[PDB]
Amino acid sequence: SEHETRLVANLLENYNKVIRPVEHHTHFVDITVGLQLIQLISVDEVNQIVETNVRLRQQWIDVRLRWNPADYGGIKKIRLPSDDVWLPDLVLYNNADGDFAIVHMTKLLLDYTGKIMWTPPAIFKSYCEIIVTHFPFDQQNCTMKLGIWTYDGTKVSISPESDRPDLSTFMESGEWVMKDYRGWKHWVYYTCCPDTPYLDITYHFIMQRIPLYFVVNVIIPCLLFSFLTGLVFYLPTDSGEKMTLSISVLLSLTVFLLVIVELIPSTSSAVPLIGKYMLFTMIFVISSIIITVVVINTHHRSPSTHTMPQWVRKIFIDTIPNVMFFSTMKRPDVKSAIEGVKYIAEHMKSDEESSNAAEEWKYVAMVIDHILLCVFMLICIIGTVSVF
Amino acid sequence: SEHETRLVANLLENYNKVIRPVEHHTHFVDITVGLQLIQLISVDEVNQIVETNVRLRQQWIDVRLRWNPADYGGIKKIRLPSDDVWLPDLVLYNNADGDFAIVHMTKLLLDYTGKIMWTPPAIFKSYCEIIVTHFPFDQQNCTMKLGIWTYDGTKVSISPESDRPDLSTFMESGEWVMKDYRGWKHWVYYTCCPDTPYLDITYHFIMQRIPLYFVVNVIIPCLLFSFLTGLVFYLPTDSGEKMTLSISVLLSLTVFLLVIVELIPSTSSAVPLIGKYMLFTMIFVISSIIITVVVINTHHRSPSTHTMPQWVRKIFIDTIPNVMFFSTMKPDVKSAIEGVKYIAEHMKSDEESSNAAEEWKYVAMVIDHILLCVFMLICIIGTVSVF
Amino acid sequence: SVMEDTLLSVLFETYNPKVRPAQTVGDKVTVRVGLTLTNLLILNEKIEEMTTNVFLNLAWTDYRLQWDPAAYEGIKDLRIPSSDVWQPDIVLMNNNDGSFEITLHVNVLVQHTGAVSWQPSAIYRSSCTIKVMYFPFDWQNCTMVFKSYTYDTSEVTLQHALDAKGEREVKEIVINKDAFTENGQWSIEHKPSRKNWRSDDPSYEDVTFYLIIQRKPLFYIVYTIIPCILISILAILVFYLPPDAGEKMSLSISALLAVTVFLLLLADKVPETSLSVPIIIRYLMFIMILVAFSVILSVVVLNLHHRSPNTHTMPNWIRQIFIETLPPFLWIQRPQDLKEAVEAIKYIAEQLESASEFDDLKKDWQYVAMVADRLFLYVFFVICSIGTFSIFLDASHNVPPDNPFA
Amino acid sequence: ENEEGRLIEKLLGDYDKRIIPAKTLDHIIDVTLKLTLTNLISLNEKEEALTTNVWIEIQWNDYRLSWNTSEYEGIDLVRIPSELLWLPDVVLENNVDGQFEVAYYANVLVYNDGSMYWLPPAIYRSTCPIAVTYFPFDWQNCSLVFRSQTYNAHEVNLQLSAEEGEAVEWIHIDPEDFTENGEWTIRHRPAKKNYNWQLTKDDTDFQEIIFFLIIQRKPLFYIINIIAPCVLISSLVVLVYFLPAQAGGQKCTLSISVLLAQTIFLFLIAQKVPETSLNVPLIGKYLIFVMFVSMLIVMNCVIVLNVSLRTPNTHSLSEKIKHLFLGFLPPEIKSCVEACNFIAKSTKEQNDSGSENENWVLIGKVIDKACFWIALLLFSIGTLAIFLTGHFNQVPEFPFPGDPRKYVP
Amino acid sequence: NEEERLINDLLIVNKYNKHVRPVKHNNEVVNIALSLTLSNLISLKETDETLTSNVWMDHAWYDHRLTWNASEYSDISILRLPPELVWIPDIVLQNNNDGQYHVAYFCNVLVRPNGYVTWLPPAIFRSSCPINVLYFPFDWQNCSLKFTALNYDANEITMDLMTDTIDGKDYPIEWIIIDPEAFTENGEWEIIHKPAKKNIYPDKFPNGTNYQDVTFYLIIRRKPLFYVINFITPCVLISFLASLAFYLPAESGEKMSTAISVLLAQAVFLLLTSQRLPETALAVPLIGKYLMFIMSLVTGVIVNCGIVLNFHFRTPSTHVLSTRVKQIFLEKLPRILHMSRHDEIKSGIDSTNYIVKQIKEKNAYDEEVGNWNLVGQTIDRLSMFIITPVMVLGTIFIFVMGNFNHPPAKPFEGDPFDYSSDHPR
């Protein structure tokens, strides 16, 4: 366009982009800053960084860039490279892993009135204080603090377009639900500069994690192995496999601990309830292993060296078994030949006595083990009902 | 300064940074190249790339940038941007994952005689041929081949500043020890360029790995799990845990061999001694499992179907056991009468069958004691050898 | 040539590449937009991004770039650096990274009529929403949204590119067989192109290129599904092991741990989205739960097998179910010294008889364990077989629609 | 009319940004330097890099950029992009990446007297050689070394800033903009000018400003998620001495599985600590110790199983062994008659053999008791000693042991 | 220094236009000679199907504008100019993986007084190399670097292979140049063939930029000693332990544990092999095929061990040892498999007769249990003899078919030329 060619030649012939667009150095540039969230790329929980794809909509008047449309064929809008005009040095204060300012110098829209509309894209990688305490059912509240870097409120004033960021073209995350989002303007009075106000807009996004992925992939297997933890108590000692089951459960749980510690930040500001419950279930498995070892030891007590204490006999054989109603427990040379038969009979009698004592020890082991089974299943019932 | 501003305006007025700094085009600009190693950032063994933080000290005389100090308020030195003057194109030939030339175009020092000092920083990610033979006790020799790219020796000559790189400011690694380092200048004739020699200076660093991380994290666990191999030999068959122990040892050893595999490049230039030793140890553990299966089968030989051959009897019962010095091994009543007789006969037969079964068990015990002593002897000779 | 120099000097004497070519105020610049795919490099499902190597075929008309060929030695067209002419800010809007623009700024081809064509190359990374429901037997619908970042419909009019013969529009991605490498993991089923508007925004117009790609799941089959089928075979087999072997726990628990390890290492290759559970993960969790119930019932069978009259009394219902009704269905039906000596013999005999009765009852318990174990064998075989078949049939019945709908 | 336009066109006109603003030949530019830490983003252990979000205040005087405020409508402060001005090339030398310069080249605040004030933000990744000796109870001593990349001490004088006449000898932590890391607590944050006396007043490396960050790990996460599980699982080995020493006791099963779990924990630690070989981490030393103790307990289990399952066939139960281990530490009629006699005799010998087997089992049980007590003591003392050493790892009271000063605002 | 005057005359005085093809007339064609020197094959990441190469990409064209009379100036036979001042052909690697189309370092061009411009910049190229995992780790790959000229169509510039002169006749350099003084051998990949071709696509027109490219192929054979030593050998041995599992007696109590452990080790090897290859569907690698076969065979071994255990623990009280089973597993198979082989006194009499009867029926029960034990032993011996040969022969066949896999001794099947540096045509 010849009209627009001449217009662009005239607008920038003696235009200095180092200077603020004010008619007097006492006036301030009023910038209407509006953040538009396009995509929530990532929430790096371990590194506590939130990547967002945003458009940083900025509007201000540059009276140096006014014209009369009648003198340019009625042209009322032009697109002008942002590198040619004065731009606000708007910085993301809480940058953690990206750029502090806008780097994609996209073209800006300029009205004949000097009104500029600049909506450059950005990938804000901002620091996000991740609260891993209800993981994976947690909601994160982390923000993007935007402000003019080298100008105070008396030179450049930034105001939000609206009380909330723009999520009209926001792509659904698939991992997070955007519950709330608001933009707050703040006047700060730093120590450097205690006379004048410094302005910044903090856009925060209240994000709710969708827990299906982590539920299925981490919590369900740990729940299965935790449930199998107490199944060792229904395993008879004679099988010779209680250690196999309990120790395999423990090995699986330590593997899941290895999996979990790499899913969350190593911060100690808050104890992750997932980690606390892993520790609790691992203490439970360790106690189960200790008690099953005690039960195995009791089951194999030799009556020769061990005599059942009277209190053990009264507790585990006389009272508790009568409590479990749903259990099916109970509650010439011929002289030498004659003497040999006598020895056979008496030795088999002593063997029967020893076998009865050993069977009593085994019954005590079974009763202890069944008590532990019932305790574990009661824990399971109260837990499952509680979550409801 | 007004004087320095005027000086810089004068020097760079007619200056063409495209031309070499030589009075006559047949001369060559001599460049003194020194490499200062600030830090050995990384040694990527798997990828065979060594990342280092260096300063590429370069010195040369630019006759066009001379001035008289008396004419400029006594100014004898100035700092000029590298991009303002002619610079040599030093290219790291063995670049692997970075920049071939310098990209940090820092300000250079210029004397009033035209003597330029330019020491730009650089992160050299150079290719490093890794020798895995003595991992993790290996020392690595890999270099940085620096040379002028487009100018042959008749136009731009580089000479090392010193015989060795400068490690005076080298930050200690914590993974490697700089055993030795030196720099060699070469006149190389290329197929591209057979008529004239191209000059380069190949700095090389002999760096010794500090073998404590890998010792603690690989070798000690490997030694523990390999030492658990003789226990299965001392472990009686009646325990029903020989396979458990031996197989657990085998699986852990396989895991650690694979972990080592993840730490070294997949190159076949040589076989790591640690990998070779652990493969041999896996072969030994597998042979021990084979012999343990044979021992377990022997222990359970039913005497009904298996009769001990004489070559087994004479050898394992009568020959080795005495050699084991340190071990402490070795009407209607007629029916009742016939029934008692039958009971006695069957008890006698059971005694004989037992005696045969215990003969088999003794054979198994002596076999596994022989294996235990073999393993113990191997352990003693190994510990003596490593000492 | 010198004539090219003169032509370039006259063309760009007052030409401002900042200014969109609109001969009269209000005119719109028409921009052919087409896409040539040279390589679908990656579809990184973990970060939901598709990496493609494409040529972006753009054509517009710059009335300012016109000349008479006869006045310039018959020069009918020029190759001009792309930065020297005005270009429409055509970008990939849904790029996953921050790279909106092309990578390679190839020369524009300017013909004497002002027809500017531009075929820059770019390694683009577009955000593709992954439907995990049927992974790895899934077909993804990845789109590359192209439009002018700067100019709206009032300034440029996006159109489809033209085919080699400038006769009809090409409403699809162009794939040049001479320069195109198949992914080997994805097969391109549909590659349509379409212009999209927004009823809530009359100033919005884009050209979207859709890539309906179907995963070839051989890798996942071989490396996850077959091993898990073998592990499920073992989980079934545990119910054929006799309880006396003392190895039912070993087998069942090893199967459970193996399936869990497979799930854990597969978690690394599946997307982290939570809108659905992939068919593979659902299958692995099915097998995990089935093997866990295998462990539970093996513990139950071991418990039954090791009961004795000294510890448990056999209830009537267990006897009824597992001794008579079930076994048929499972085909698993089964002188003072002489007085002292005579007293010793009597004691030995009655002790042997007592042992015989105790052994008969213990054998009844063992038989109940055997019958229950056989019942579980059949039930678990049926459940595993038909559940696996149903899941994989459901996966198999997942193909992209014949009409791409775009 | 914006008078700043005319003022800046006067200032930058005929202004050369390659020229150090030295008024005379002997003038040295004082480059004041202050660091404001707004966020300690991370201390990457594996790559030994500290990432910080810092505002670095750099102040110098450029006599060329001075004017008479009365001549420009009272303007005393302008903002000029730092790309148009001379800057002291102040860089972070100990950077892991090649990022010497600041992240964002903010404007420079220029005052009418020539005073220049530059407060650019930066994401610096600086080398922090990590001492693992007491991990996870460790405190690290990270350093941000700043110096001119271009100018030596004969022409630039790096110094720490000073408000109200007192030098700011610490990293500034502004409450209005600072986030607690959650894994690392800042205990000391001194700053000091350092000299390299191996270099001369030239060489551009003679002088430097070093900002130190002595940070202490918060170990609750590591305790709860690694050390507590590790100690609990490692305490399971002692349980093997209460399992029967016979088939079905699963003694070696339990001990070997605990050893495997400890190996898994070694692999876990491998991903949390650097690959440096100067020291073994405290948790690493504990894992090595408990793996060795578990191997000893596996040996002990094998020996006990060997002893308990001894038979008269294989081994002769010596009387002295019994004394030591159980005394200190704890024709029809004739044919029927011979048949009966043989039955009784055989039964008697079988029962005696069983008795000697039982006696070997008793010896094994005694060895289990003694070895349990030894192993429990060994494991308990090792755990207590190592993790008490971790507990008693203290951050030094002063930022520099020699200096009596605290280096705090 | 008359380089100053010469470069001034060539560039400023003559109004040299960097953006115009070096042709006198528009219809002329610039001939760009192109060769590739490989200095280091940095890596071939199979997972990302990327070839990283350290190459020197040699360009040679004629620029009539950069001609000068060497005598008019102090004799200057050569001149170095930055490529940002002269016209260079933008030859781009079309099949790159990252966004690096051009070369890394834009070094000076060399210009002779006849206008012959040579440009030899170094580059790190990351090109797309589709991976054939079929015979991994005994595989050879066929990586190509396809270079196109997208800045000018084929009517304007013609890509060609650089030619070389040996004894007066010029022959095209139809291969990647490898300089012994500047080539680093890859410890994992051996270069077998390295041809270079100038491809023309007749279905396209010279009007376009897709009509003609220069492609440098690189057929490289993997050196498998690493994978054989560290992957195949452990897997094979651990597999043979599965066959060993048949020799354990059923009363050992560790038959199933042994077989299962072998299966888990094989699964671990399968997963670690899975992590080392791309997730394509063109083929199951040779090692993957072997692992699938051996895992299926070991699962069969586990099932057969379960069957042997089921048979061993049968008793007369739960199962009847059928005469068919006896005849097969105790008489016939054993031999084929060559397997080894006064109120008092009557009461007392009644008690002893009852004791005898009980002991006698106990002996019969034990005899039948022993028969079941022998049946189990027969089954496991049969299964050993039937599965160890299958395991061994499958292993040998699979890992011999791997070693009998070599590149075809000539690239371009239909071409008899060797494309060898020592025999140009």
Ligand SMILES: *[C@@H]1O[C@H](CO)[C@@H](O[C@@H]2O[C@H](CO)[C@@H](O)[C@H](O)[C@H]2NC(C)=O)[C@H](O)[C@H]1NC(C)=O
């Ligand atoms: C480049 O050359 C080809 C072949 O000469 C041109 O193809 C012609 O295109 C016109 C325009 O549609 C058709 O009418 C002719 O039938 C085509 N010829 C053939 C042989 O197919 C092509 O148009 C040319 N393109 C440019 C940009 O010059």
